[PDB]
Ligand binder design. Structure first.
Ligand SMILES: *CCC(=O)N(CCC(=O)Nc1ccnc(-n2ccnc2C)c1Br)c1ccnc(-n2ccnc2C)c1Br
Ligand SMILES: Nc1nc2c(ncn2[C@@H]2O[C@H](COP(=O)(O)OP(=O)(O)O)[C@@H](O)[C@H]2O)c(=O)[nH]1
Length: 167
């Protein structure tokens, strides 16, 4: 069966790990715990096709570190994550997208824009700003909450669909 290497990028604290832990381990915990189980693999069925998801979480890596460069060049698709209550994380998306484009030497890389923490009443980045940005990039935009599980599976499955359209 086909294996998809999905890379999760974005500023520290946007919820890249919480999104991964929900998808793979079925839970959310607010407290940071680095001793949690190291599973990043899940067998799943998307649009009838059975596949294996391998999630490469860039959290905890220094920017420009070797492991981060390795994750990016082996990754087939990218989730570009910002938090809806973190303006700077949204402004940083352009930087993460340009970096993926450089490391892949491609102007057409499968990507999904993810607006995380959509359970928060606290909102400094509007849906329209994110929809206009994803439209200019020609990529899907998905609103998620790693806390309530809203849009989580949709964001990773939409990325797999983007990889398939590309191939
Ligand atoms: C800038 C903040 C952090 O990056 N960070 C570390 C977060 C981290 O490494 N998370 C992470 C990376 C890769 N895999 C997993 N993971 C385990 C199981 N499944 C997955 C997806 C995870 Br959980 C961070 C966050 C919060 N606090 C701290 N911290 C503790 C003490 N001092 C500091 C700043 C850190 Br370093
Ligand atoms: N309210 C809320 N908090 C979240 C959500 N996702 C992550 N967080 C919290 O935001 C903090 C940072 O998340 P983390 O997954 O470690 O971010 P990362 O650095 O991008 O991997 C933690 O306290 C999480 O519990 C979410 O959807 N909603």
């Amino acid at each position: 069966m086909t294996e998809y290497k999905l890379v999760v990028v974005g500023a520290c604290g946007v919820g890249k790990s919480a999104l991964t832990i929900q998808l793979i381990q079925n839970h959310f915990v607010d407290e940071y715990d680095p001793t949690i189980e190291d599973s990043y693999r899940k067998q799943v069925v998307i649009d009838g096709e059975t596949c294996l998801l391998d999630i490469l979480d860039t959290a905890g890596q220094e920017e420009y570190s070797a492991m981060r460069d390795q994750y990016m060049r082996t990754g087939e698709g990218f989730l570009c994550v910002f938090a809806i209550n973190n303006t700077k994380s949204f402004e940083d998306i352009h930087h993460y997208r340009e970096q993926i484009k450089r490391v892949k030497d491609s102007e057409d890389v499968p990507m999904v824009l993810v607006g995380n923490k959509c359970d928060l009443p606290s909102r400094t980045v509007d849906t329209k700003q994110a929809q206009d940005l994803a439209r200019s990039y020609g990529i899907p935009f998905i609103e998620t909450s790693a806390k309530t599980r809203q849009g989580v599976d949709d964001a990773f499955y939409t990325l797999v669909r983007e990889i398939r359209k590309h191939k």
